[PDB]
UniProtKB/Swiss-Prot annotation, chains A, B:
One of its GO terms (molecular function) is glycerol-3-phosphate dehydrogenase (NAD+) activity. This is Glycerol-3-phosphate dehydrogenase [NAD(+)], glycosomal. It comes from Leishmania mexicana. Substrate binds at K117, R266, N267. It is found in: Glycosome. The keyword Lipid metabolism does not apply. It is an enzyme of class 1 (oxidoreductase). GO terms for biological process: carbohydrate metabolic process; glycerol-3-phosphate catabolic process.
Length: 349, 349
């Protein structure tokens, strides 16, 4: 079935750049799209201006997108639910505001699409695992790929993966999310673990790429970091029981290479500033958008230690981000290994 | 052993941007480096200016680099030979000027490092196979990775792969080419087929990335092209009997992602101009540097046909370059497939 599905209503819990961008996609597919934001005064401003002046400036909202601070008005009648709340705020949302949403989603068996990327600080859980404490796992699918919000929001060609345990669920969602003007194209997979691992780790690597840039290194170095970094995604995926199909697909390779290669990435930008010598405390004090890699770096290290997975690049980035290791010392220690084989396994016999 | 090796002399056959860049690397490892160039008047100019004003403007040559037009003086006493002559000119060099060089390399068993990328028009041969008509296989190794000439020549951090059938040869060359200031770092491998396929095909794909950019597409689109394109490298590598370890290594993923992402790529730049509406004939007449993808695209299609390997992106790129196909029509034909699975095989159970 290559034919598109359309809905009466979608709800997006996530008022940031990406939640808004995905609301813009859904506006083409749904009669009505509701976006939930926590602050009522800010909601009124966004609705009045027909522009998310908080988190996606310069993009006029479609008329069929409405912001609200009322969780129940947001989800009522929704036929798909998207979560795009940043990782470290997801749990709080369900604890504070999620009770009746949970009962609704369960009652009406509403598909949930997790678009958040990262690892939660103390629990070491991926976003879908956080959500899985509150909602049944069969309702949960994962969206992941190279999808900068500004390009997605304005309908510039974008490919993403949708992962679900059951491939027929992924294929249905692919028909809901994909657009007939071919601006947003989804590809189905079952590798939910590979998708979420790649998504979380790629943000940490992107800080590394930004550090390289800030230190005055070039495009050759960036390419080397992407290539060696993907190995870390691959090894963690294997240790966590993922089948690894996502690693060299849109969620892994595609998103990793995208995020490591542009200042549009908030994580890249954090890296650049660290490489130029700013402390993380000042970066984060003056930042108006979430850089998930910052909070992910520590729980990623703890998870990898637990599973005995060596992640040399992510380890040094963690040292820079959380232990104030001078980026030049981190670089030196990274390259202290001496000469080696590329060391990749054959794909073929 | 990971201690560096130093030579008395190296010779580089290839006076272009990359040959000159690699001579700059070798000037750190060798007492003397000779670069062969076909034209004596231009040789005198380069030597006088202490700058390759023909093909690498703005970079001052090390004092221990000398250009020459005399083949026999170039290789005399050299303990490594690099070939960096563009693919379509390699054969002519051996037929017209290579007789004594060939005897020297054989008699003294001098390691030869092939740095040229592409596929030769009539024969469908990779650069090491062309050279392999004249020099025996145990002397041939291949250099491949994300290594833009300007960054290499000026000592900005670069990683490359060196492939040889015997891993011990590759590891020896790695010790000769890698620098102690850690500016140029080599990784050993045996996947010579994978390296050379990736090197040839990535140039064609880079034209495609350029076309996307010239058509006004964004970074999300670029990431998708890189991800899908690598599958074509992978499939062709399998058909040609490579073990595929290089596909997601520096030669494949690394070099592809680099070349598809920067106007420093000659092939990207050709693509961009094609995407903007310029005919290939105008591009080629105002071109001051080789775009290997242009000439490669034809034999690449013939080889893929011969092997029954589908290469959907490379096919459309070939149509744009050789058959006057409107880039917008090529894009439409690419995007007419309907919704699919990502369809990558698992790496693990
Ligand atoms: N922005 C993107 O391009 C992008 C974003 N994501 C993910 O989307 C998630 C949402 O982040 P966002 O980009 O929408 O973030 P803003 O920083 O734009 O929004 C902040 C939201 O958080 C709320 N918020 C802020 N503070 C609080 C507190 N204290 N409490 C509760 N709620 C709060 C606020 O009200 C907004 O709703 C996050 O997990 C990202 O990893 C995935 C895909 C893409 C891209 O493919 C991508 O991955 C981009 O890479 P990158 O390197 O990430 O740019
Ligand atoms: N330039 C690079 O950054 C680069 C270049 N290469 C390869 O190096 C090989 C040599 O190319 P070059 O870049 O040095 O090319 P110039 O165009 O700089 O030199 C032309 C040479 O050809 C001679 N020449 C010119 N016309 C003739 C004729 N008619 N007869 C004989 N000899 C001739 C001339 O005298 C020079 O020696 C070629 O196969 C490339 O694929 C690999 C690695 C890198 C980079 O990683 C890389 O791959 C770059 O990607 P890209 O997309 O390619 O930019």
């Amino acid at each position: 079935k290559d034919e598109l599905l359309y809905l009466n209503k979608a709800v997006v819990f996530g008022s940031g750049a990406f939640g808004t961008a995905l609301a813009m996609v859904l506006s083409k597919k749904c009669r009505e799209v509701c976006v939930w934001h926590m602050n009522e005064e800010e909601v009124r401003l966004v609705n009045e201006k027909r522009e998310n002046v908080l988190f996606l400036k310069g993009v006029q909202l479609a008329s069929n997108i409405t912001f609200t601070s009322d969780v129940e008005k947001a989800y009522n009648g929704a036929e798909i639910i998207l979560f795009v709340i940043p990782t470290q705020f997801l749990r709080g949302f369900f604890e504070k505001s999620g009770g009746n949403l949970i009962a609704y989603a369960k009652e009406k068996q509403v598909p949930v699409l997790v678009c958040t990327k990262g690892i939660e600080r103390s629990t070491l859980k991926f976003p879908a695992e956080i959500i899985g404490e509150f909602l049944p796992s069969p309702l949960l699918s994962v969206l992941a790929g190279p999808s900068f919000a500004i390009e997605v929001a304005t309908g510039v060609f974008t490919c993403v993966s949708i992962a679900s345990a059951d491939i027929n669920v992924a294929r249905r969602l692919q028909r809901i999310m994909s657009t007939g003007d071919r601006s947003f194209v989804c590809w189905a997979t079952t590798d939910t673990v590979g998708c979420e691992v790649a998504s979380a780790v790629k943000n940490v690597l992107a800080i590394g790429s930004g550090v390289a840039n800030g230190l005055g290194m070039g495009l050759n170095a960036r390419a080397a970091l992407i290539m060696r970094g993907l190995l870390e995604i691959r090894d963690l995926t294997a240790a966590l029981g993922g089948d690894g199909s996502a690693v060299f697909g849109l969620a892994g390779l595609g998103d990793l290479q995208l995020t490591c290669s542009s200042e549009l990435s908030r994580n890249f930008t954090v890296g650049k500033k660290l490489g130029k010598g700013l402390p993380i405390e000042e970066i984060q004090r003056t930042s108006k958008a979430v850089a998930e890699g910052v909070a992910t770096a520590d729980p990623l290290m703890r998870l990898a230690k637990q599973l005995k997975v060596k992640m040399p690049l992510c380890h040094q980035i963690y040292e820079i981000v959380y232990k104030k290791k001078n980026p030049r010392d981190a670089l030196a220690d990274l390259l202290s290994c001496g000469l080696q084989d590329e060391g990749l396994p054959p794909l073929f016999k």
